[PDB]
Design a protein around this ligand. Sequence first.
Ligand code: OGA
Ligand code: MG
Ligand code: NI
Ligand code: ZN
Length: 331
Amino acid sequence: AQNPNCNIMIFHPTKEEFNDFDKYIAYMESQGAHRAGLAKIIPPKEWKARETYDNISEILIATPLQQVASGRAGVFTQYHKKKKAMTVGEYRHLANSKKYQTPPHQNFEDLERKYWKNRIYNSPIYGADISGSLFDENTKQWNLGHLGTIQDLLEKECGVVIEGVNTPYLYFGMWKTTFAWHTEDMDLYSINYLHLGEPKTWYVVPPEHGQRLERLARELFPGSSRGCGAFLRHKVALISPTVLKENGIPFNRITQEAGEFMVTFPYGYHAGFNHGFNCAEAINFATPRWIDYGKMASQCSCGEARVTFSMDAFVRILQPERYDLWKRGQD
Ligand SMILES: O=C(O)CNC(=O)C(=O)O
Ligand SMILES: [Mg+2]
Ligand code: NI
Ligand SMILES: [Zn+2]
């Protein structure tokens, strides 16, 4: 069995290997990458996403989200308070202001320590989930707006034609902006490209151990767990590495820098934080190996998780027994 300790693997494809996206995902899996839940892909030196980032300031963040924490430093929830619209140029200035800028630090480890110590005492503002793309239309390799769609994959594998579309999303971050512990909708893959700016630190639980994280989460968030049998789908709970280690939960960590891709694998729980002003682009995708994970994915039916139009067909076709209850939660 490849990668039996479930370590995060890092890949350096050549320009030739960067042509066929599906083939390279399958290659990574042949080497055991999926066992970690997360892999890093460093593009060949010949590749670029676009020519420059000098002309992005007029992009609108229609609903910036202020991430307000409750709990203790290693075990907290966050809620998202909606703020007035602002442009990327206004948001970058805000990120760099004395109130929100990254503190002086020695290295990534020192900054990680400061994050876990101090996150709860601040409320950073995240420009998340903005439909759009920063890949040049002429970039033919690993262009996240030109991937094969999940609807087409389900059709190729299972024969059923379904409605829905699959497009990328932009994330504009600042120091302390946080992504809570989650797997993807329908336990899909995700791919994330850090276009510019400061790093993003990730934490991940191997898919084979995801239920250990869930059991801890039910212990640590007992009211939430009573409210919903899949409350991590709400994407609001944080647990620190120190707490994970105290409770024996298997995980790994890695820092992504500008110019790097990360791939999350089906049912790989992940969480993390941004180091300073940055911009990422991400999208969900599927492969043939995903289908069995989609069929078994948990679902939130309490009303909180509320998701895209395109998840309807996935539930309807892969999970017909669950469909009626899930759809009630949507309405
Ligand atoms: O970058 C973020 O805020 C969150 N991204 C992801 O969870 C992802 O790419 O799957
Ligand atoms: Mg612009
Ligand atoms: Ni994710
Ligand atoms: Zn729920």
